[PDB]
Amino acid sequence: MEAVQNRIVEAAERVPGVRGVIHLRARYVGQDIWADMIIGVDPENTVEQAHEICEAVQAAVCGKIRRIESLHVSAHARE
């Protein structure tokens, strides 16, 4: 699991507009991972931009870690 969490954080951090991973909770449901995360974003990004960054994180993380079958990504102002 720690190897999986490290991969999730690394994948998320490589997406344009991510200012770190604030929170990540991952759980196994069988052999699948279900995860919930919060990313940091520029406080001056629009809410629509933050939504786009979250969607990009979801695509990036699910594309790179095939065992993830549910991923929720939300955003919070940081830096």
Place this chain on the structure above:
Amino acid sequence: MEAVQNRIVEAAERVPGVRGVIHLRARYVGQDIWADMIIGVDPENTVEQAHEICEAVQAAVCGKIRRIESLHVSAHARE
């Protein structure tokens, strides 16, 4: 293991100068992976350049897949 082999191939293919993965054999030794691979390279690269590409593949693949504890990379002319 197939998930691991897919990650090895994908990581190798993203290194400048790799013209596909020609061969990959991976084995578990305990929880560790030992692997041997052959990459394709430009036939007009020098032997020194091919050596540099192999070393770059080794770094890239070992950096991305933490369970690998031995990786040998060789090169063959392709395309």
